[PDB]
Amino acid sequence: ELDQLRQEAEQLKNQIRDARKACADATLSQITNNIDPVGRIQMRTRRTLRGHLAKIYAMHWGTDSRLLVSASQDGKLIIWDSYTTNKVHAIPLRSSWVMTCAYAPSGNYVACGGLDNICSIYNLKTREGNVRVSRELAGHTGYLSCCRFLDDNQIVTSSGDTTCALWDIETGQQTTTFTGHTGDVMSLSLAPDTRLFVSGACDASAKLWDVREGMCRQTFTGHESDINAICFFPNGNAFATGSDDATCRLFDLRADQELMTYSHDNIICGITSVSFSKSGRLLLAGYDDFNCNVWDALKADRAGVLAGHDNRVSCLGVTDDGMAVATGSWDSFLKIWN
Amino acid sequence: CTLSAEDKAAVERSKMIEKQLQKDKQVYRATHRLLLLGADNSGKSTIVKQMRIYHVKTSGIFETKFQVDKVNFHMFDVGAQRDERRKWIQCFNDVTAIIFVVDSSDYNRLQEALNDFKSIWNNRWLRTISVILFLNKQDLLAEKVLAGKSKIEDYFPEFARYTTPEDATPEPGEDPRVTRAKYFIRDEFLRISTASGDGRHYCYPHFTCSVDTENARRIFNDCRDIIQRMHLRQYELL
Amino acid sequence: TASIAQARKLVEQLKMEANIDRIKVSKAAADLMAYCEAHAKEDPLLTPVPASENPFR
Amino acid sequence: GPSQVVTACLLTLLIIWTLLGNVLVCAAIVRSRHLRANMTNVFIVSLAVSDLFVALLVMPWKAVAEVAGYWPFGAFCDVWVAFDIMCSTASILNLCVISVDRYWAISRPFRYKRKMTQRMALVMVGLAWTLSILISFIPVQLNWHRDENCDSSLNRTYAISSSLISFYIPVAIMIVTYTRIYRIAQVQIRRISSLERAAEHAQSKKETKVLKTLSVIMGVFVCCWLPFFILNCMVPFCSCVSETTFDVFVWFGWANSSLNPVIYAFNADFQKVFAQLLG
Ligand SMILES: CC(C)CCC[C@@H](C)[C@H]1CC[C@H]2[C@@H]3CC=C4C[C@@H](O)CC[C@]4(C)[C@H]3CC[C@]12C
Ligand SMILES: CC(C)CCC[C@@H](C)[C@H]1CC[C@H]2[C@@H]3CC=C4C[C@@H](O)CC[C@]4(C)[C@H]3CC[C@]12C
Ligand SMILES: CC(C)CCC[C@@H](C)[C@H]1CC[C@H]2[C@@H]3CC=C4C[C@@H](O)CC[C@]4(C)[C@H]3CC[C@]12C
Ligand SMILES: CC(C)CCC[C@@H](C)[C@H]1CC[C@H]2[C@@H]3CC=C4C[C@@H](O)CC[C@]4(C)[C@H]3CC[C@]12C
Ligand SMILES: CC(C)CCC[C@@H](C)[C@H]1CC[C@H]2[C@@H]3CC=C4C[C@@H](O)CC[C@]4(C)[C@H]3CC[C@]12C
Ligand SMILES: CC(C)CCC[C@@H](C)[C@H]1CC[C@H]2[C@@H]3CC=C4C[C@@H](O)CC[C@]4(C)[C@H]3CC[C@]12C
Ligand SMILES: CC(C)CCC[C@@H](C)[C@H]1CC[C@H]2[C@@H]3CC=C4C[C@@H](O)CC[C@]4(C)[C@H]3CC[C@]12C
Ligand SMILES: CC(C)CCC[C@@H](C)[C@H]1CC[C@H]2[C@@H]3CC=C4C[C@@H](O)CC[C@]4(C)[C@H]3CC[C@]12C
Ligand SMILES: CC(C)CCC[C@@H](C)[C@H]1CC[C@H]2[C@@H]3CC=C4C[C@@H](O)CC[C@]4(C)[C@H]3CC[C@]12C
Ligand SMILES: CC(C)CCC[C@@H](C)[C@H]1CC[C@H]2[C@@H]3CC=C4C[C@@H](O)CC[C@]4(C)[C@H]3CC[C@]12C
Numbered sequence: 013e014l015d016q017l018r019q020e021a022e023q024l025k026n027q028i029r030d031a032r033k034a035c036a037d038a039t040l041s042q043i044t045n046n047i048d049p050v051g052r053i054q055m056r057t058r059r060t061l062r063g064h065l066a067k068i069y070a071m072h073w074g075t076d077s078r079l080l081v082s083a084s085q086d087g088k089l090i091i092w093d094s095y096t097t098n099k100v101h102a103i104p105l106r107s108s109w110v111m112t113c114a115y116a117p118s119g120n121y122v123a124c125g126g127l128d129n130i131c132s133i134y135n136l137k138t139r140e141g142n143v144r145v146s147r148e149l150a151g152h153t154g155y156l157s158c159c160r161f162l163d164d165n166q167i168v169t170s171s172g173d174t175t176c177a178l179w180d181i182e183t184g185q186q187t188t189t190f191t192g193h194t195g196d197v198m199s200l201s202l203a204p205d206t207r208l209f210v211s212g213a214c215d216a217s218a219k220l221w222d223v224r225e226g227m228c229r230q231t232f233t234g235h236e237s238d239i240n241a242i243c244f245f246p247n248g249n250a251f252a253t254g255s256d257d258a259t260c261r262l263f264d265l266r267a268d269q270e271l272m273t274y275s276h277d278n279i280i281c282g283i284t285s286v287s288f289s290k291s292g293r294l295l296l297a298g299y300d301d302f303n304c305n306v307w308d309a310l311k312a313d314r315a316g317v318l319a320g321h322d323n324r325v326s327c328l329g330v331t332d333d334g335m336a337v338a339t340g341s342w343d344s345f346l347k348i349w350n
Numbered sequence: 351c352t353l354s355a356e357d358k359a360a361v362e363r364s365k366m367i368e369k370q371l372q373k374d375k376q377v378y379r380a381t382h383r384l385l386l387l388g389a390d391n392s393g394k395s396t397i398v399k400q401m402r403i404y405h406v407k408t409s410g411i412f413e414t415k416f417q418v419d420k421v422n423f424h425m426f427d428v429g430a431q432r433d434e435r436r437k438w439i440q441c442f443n444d445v446t447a448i449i450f451v452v453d454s455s456d457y458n459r460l461q462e463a464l465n466d467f468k469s470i471w472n473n474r475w476l477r478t479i480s481v482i483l484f485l486n487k488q489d490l491l492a493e494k495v496l497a498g499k500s501k502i503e504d505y506f507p508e509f510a511r512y513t514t515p516e517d518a519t520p521e522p523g524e525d526p527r528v529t530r531a532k533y534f535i536r537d538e539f540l541r542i543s544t545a546s547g548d549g550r551h552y553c554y555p556h557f558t559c560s561v562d563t564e565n566a567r568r569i570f571n572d573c574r575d576i577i578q579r580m581h582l583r584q585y586e587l588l
Numbered sequence: 589t590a591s592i593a594q595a596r597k598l599v600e601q602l603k604m605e606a607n608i609d610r611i612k613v614s615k616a617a618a619d620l621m622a623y624c625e626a627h628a629k630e631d632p633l634l635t636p637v638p639a640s641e642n643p644f645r
Numbered sequence: 646g647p648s649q650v651v652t653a654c655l656l657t658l659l660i661i662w663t664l665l666g667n668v669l670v671c672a673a674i675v676r677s678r679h680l681r682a683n684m685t686n687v688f689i690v691s692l693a694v695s696d697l698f699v700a701l702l703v704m705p706w707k708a709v710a711e712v713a714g715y716w717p718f719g720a721f722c723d724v725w726v727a728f729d730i731m732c733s734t735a736s737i738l739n740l741c742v743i744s745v746d747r748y749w750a751i752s753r754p755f756r757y758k759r760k761m762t763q764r765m766a767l768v769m770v771g772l773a774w775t776l777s778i779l780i781s782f783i784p785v786q787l788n789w790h791r792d793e794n795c796d797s798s799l800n801r802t803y804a805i806s807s808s809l810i811s812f813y814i815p816v817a818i819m820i821v822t823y824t825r826i827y828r829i830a831q832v833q834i835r836r837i838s839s840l841e842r843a844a845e846h847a848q849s850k851k852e853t854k855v856l857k858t859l860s861v862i863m864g865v866f867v868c869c870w871l872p873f874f875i876l877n878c879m880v881p882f883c884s885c886v887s888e889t890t891f892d893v894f895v896w897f898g899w900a901n902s903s904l905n906p907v908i909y910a911f912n913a914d915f916q917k918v919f920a921q922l923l924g
């Protein structure tokens with residue numbers, strides 16, 4: 013018989029529901045009461061990067077805060093100079109159905125993948141200058157949902173096969189896999205130290221992983237529905253999430269629970285993407301509402317809106333130095349804001 | 351202008367990349383993208399092989415080029431994914447059509463195919479995508495009816511009520527039982543498709559066997575009708 | 589059948605996630621307060637820099 | 646006094662309506678990158694520019710002369726005859742170009758998606774304006790059109806020839822193109838109706854939408870222009886009709902210019918952008 017394991021699991025959950033309530037001496041909304049709110053964040057479009065044919069489905073900033081990758085389902089990955097709006101590279105992908113791209117912290121490599129189940133790594137700084145595939149990381153049994161480089165020889169990927177994996181780029185194989193999620197793993201973000209990462213999935217949960225122990229360390233469950241986006245708060249001790257729930261939620265790695273929730277009665281559609289400003293003070297979120305809301309991260313007031321898109325906001329990223337946010341969309345344009 | 355040799359090289363590089371993008375935009379308009387769907391029994395695998403006269407295995411999508419009357423089609427078969435469709439399907443918000451394949455000979459499986467069609471048809475992200483139905487293995491449907499086994503009513507009790515549309519066009523020498531059966535199952539997908547979507551998308555049924563060399567011609571004819579109805583709606587003539 | 593090992597591995601995960609040490613929500617929130625107030629002076633989306641400093645003008 | 650005030654009010658209202666409607670079309674396109682990306686809008690804005698020129702360049706001065714009973718703007722009368730012939734012709738030729746775009750799209754759907762571009766749209770518009778400029782300006786400046794008051798009377802050869810190019814050829818093209826569109830729409834409606842009927846039968850009028858849309862498009866265009874263009878041929882050939890009757894049918898031709906933005910630009914994508922701009 014199995015049921016002793018179900019009894020043990022249920023009592024372990026009962027213990028941790030109680031342990032989280034024993035930590036719940038306050039709320040962020042209570043201790044925030046004396047904080048002076050942010051002014052109305054009247055940001056405006058400073059560039060419009062145009063040239064993609066289809067819907068833009070992902071983007072990522074370089075650590076230099078100049079360069080951008082973005083990917084669209086016409087099968088181009090384009091590299092842009094954000095200051096001059098020059099196209100530095102345009103890369104023909106072998107499959108059209110790209111769903112993620114990422115750009116190395118050195119600027120040497122870009123990665124992307126999607127419905128082909130493969131992560132393709134491109135070397136930008138090859139001798140002949142004409143860019144080409146370095147390696148293809150085959151081994152996931154479902155489409156790639158996210159990619160992040162830890163360094164020029166380590167990448168973490170998440171997949172529709174319900175797993176994450178860590179790879180060695182020189183070997184071209186998985187050196188760890190992460191398997192506690194159920195349903196499709198949607199989104200993924202490294203901690204600032206790159207020793208932890210979080211992932212969110214269609215099980216309506218987020219999980220915290222150690223990169224080298226290879227195991228889940230905490231699980232978070234506050235969403236009533238499917239999680240599309242996740243991001244670390246800049247201190248590394250907390251993270252935000254966004255979902256088909258029409259809510260953002262913020263969690264802390266030591267309180268082990270929802271610390272805050274962001275919602276308004278005017279919004280009922282899914283959240284596609286999230287990010288923080290450099291101090292963590294603002295949470296920026298993209299929607300199926302064709303626009304981005306900007307939230308006071310401590311108060312959960314809407315501090316502003318970015319309204320410049322004609323179709324679903326697919327991706328959103330603040331620069332590594334905080335000097336801008338770029339937002340992509342199914343309208344095929346990238347807009348940069350201050 | 352104020353360009354250094356470096357800024358000149360960056361602008362020249364940009365204009366060369368823009369020249370390449372502007373050329374590839376012609377190819378992207380000159381081709382039609384099709385998503386091919388259907389269960390394990392459907393025979394979609396034999397349809398796609400038989401189309402290649404018009405032209406790693408663990409990868410999560412397969413692609414087939416074909417052309418008819420100098421129009422290009424790219425047909426995508428999603429395979430080696432998990433069975434939960436609800437997320438990856440959002441990529442196909444902008445295909446010309448979905449091709450949906452059914453094994454008409456499996457009365458046990460046919461309600462799964464109707465449920466699978468219903469969740470495709472009513473999907474939030476597919477509100478403007480028309481479906482081409484291939485009601486496949488019509489030879490095996492003829493065999494299972496002509497064998498006299500007389501059992502469709504065990505699965506579908508309205509087949510005791512149903513009688514053939516006067517709009518029906520049976521082929522020469524087709525039996526009235528075979529004809530009543532093939533039009534009955536067709537009209538179940540018409541029951542689903544005509545109930546929703548207010549002329550923003552349409553369903554195009556065909557009776558077929560996977561060996562039909564006519565299947566690429568059927569896709570061409572329906573894509574032509576799909577684009578005509580789409581233009582006719584912009585001008586409020588539908 | 590293999591469901592015994594699946595339920596057993598789940599109980600090991602729930603043990604490991606139960607055994608982790610935890611902190612009062614008041615202290616956790618106060619760390620986010622301290623980090624925001626320390627860095628808000630240097631976060632250019634809150635307080636716009638002039639077009640001479642901004643590469644995006 | 647009373648008829649002077651009444652006509653001043655009515656002509657002012659008609660000018661302002663024509664000005665506002667065509668301004669809204671120009672206001673919508675400039676702010677909307679998706680509207681600019683859809684090729685068909687290049688024609689709809691070109692129509693609205695033609696109709697905006699009728700409102701600014703032509704109608705106001707004739708309205709002043711009608712309330713006054715005399716023409717004050719003497720050297721301008723020769724220029725005004727060119728402005729009128731050009732922007733009146735441009736408005737008709739823009740409608741004819743819109744019919745050929747709609748017919749190409751419906752008739753040859755793959756070849757349209759492949760070969761239609763912002764360059765192709767701009768060439769079609771550029772030829773409509775070019776032909777309206779050439780017919781008006783070269784004949785008026787060469788004094789080929791003529792055989793205080795403004796002499797708008799015409800030479801017999803120029804009146805007939807100008808009516809063929811500006812109206813009778815473009816209405817023949819609009820009749821052929823919209824007739825073939827009606828036949829293609831009837832084929833698709835029979836197919837749809839068959840599958841709907843089979844679904845209702847198994848579970849156990851749309852042609853009027855096509856007729857309404859095409860009868861508004863052809864009905865408004867032919868009603869306003871056809872009375873004027875028939876008189877425009879008769880009157881110089883007879884040198885047969887009272888000048889008051891001629892002036893009312895002239896005002897019907899420009900009245901079509903006010904209806905043009907209602908018929909062509911009230912579609913839901915424009916209608917959203919109007920609501921979004923206006924708040
Ligand atoms: C004095 C006469 C000739 C002026 C006639 C007005 C013409 C020049 C106007 C009317 C509508 C206009 C077009 C409206 C929309 C677009 C789409 C945009 O993506 C490029 C410019 C383009 C193609 C415009 C170019 C100029 C245009 C064609
Ligand atoms: C695109 C549109 C808005 C341009 C309009 C330009 C107009 C105002 C210009 C173009 C040609 C001009 C006319 C050309 C010749 C003459 C004859 C002269 O003895 C009196 C002025 C008069 C009558 C001009 C008045 C102004 C005029 C009508
Ligand atoms: C006397 C007047 C009405 C003659 C002008 C007729 C009108 C309808 C003209 C104006 C611009 C013309 C178009 C200009 C360019 C092209 C592209 C070519 O590849 C096919 C024909 C096509 C599409 C032309 C068809 C006729 C056309 C639409
Ligand atoms: C741009 C083109 C295609 C437009 C058509 C121009 C037509 C209307 C032109 C071309 C040649 C012209 C004729 C040339 C010469 C004369 C002699 C003059 O004493 C009276 C007018 C008359 C008889 C002209 C009438 C108008 C005319 C027929
Ligand atoms: C392009 C084709 C289909 C157009 C066919 C109709 C044309 C040719 C018709 C329509 C109106 C007609 C004119 C109407 C009135 C008159 C006055 C009469 O005393 C002599 C003939 C004359 C001058 C006609 C000539 C032919 C005409 C211009
Ligand atoms: C005076 C009257 C009777 C003349 C009628 C002329 C008609 C038949 C002409 C005018 C403009 C023409 C169209 C202009 C452009 C194209 C695009 C081309 O790729 C295929 C033919 C097609 C679609 C033409 C078909 C014939 C057409 C509609
Ligand atoms: C010189 C001009 C003003 C003459 C106008 C004659 C018009 C009204 C005539 C000429 C050709 C006619 C069309 C010829 C064919 C058809 C197809 C039929 O299934 C419905 C009626 C319809 C669409 C006719 C309607 C009336 C019609 C458009
Ligand atoms: C006063 C000036 C502007 C002339 C206006 C005339 C217009 C309003 C007339 C001319 C022809 C008419 C159309 C002729 C035929 C039909 C088909 C019928 O089933 C519904 C009405 C409808 C669609 C009419 C609506 C009004 C109409 C479009
Ligand atoms: C409205 C559209 C569809 C049809 C137009 C039909 C044309 C032929 C009709 C409409 C109004 C008519 C005119 C009305 C009044 C007069 C005054 C009379 O002393 C001579 C005939 C004359 C000048 C008519 C000639 C024919 C005419 C121009
Ligand atoms: C639906 C809208 C566009 C219909 C517009 C109707 C227009 C054509 C009507 C309304 C009032 C009319 C005017 C009323 C009185 C006069 C005085 C007369 O001595 C000459 C004609 C003139 C100046 C008329 C011309 C036609 C006119 C401007």
Ligand SMILES: CCCN(CCc1cccs1)[C@H]1CCc2c(O)cccc2C1
Nearest residue numbers: 729730733734797807808811895898899
């Ligand atoms: C609405 C009609 C405006 N005008 C009429 C000008 C007037 C004459 C008498 C009183 S006011 C015509 C003149 C002739 C012509 C033409 O040959 C070809 C294309 C357009 C036009 C426009």
Ligand SMILES: CCCCCCCCCCCCCCCC(=O)O
Nearest residue numbers: 668669671672674675681690694697
């Ligand atoms: C924008 C305010 C109202 C319109 C004022 C200008 C009217 C005359 C010129 C209109 C045509 C030129 C603009 C076409 C659109 C474009 O170039 O993008």
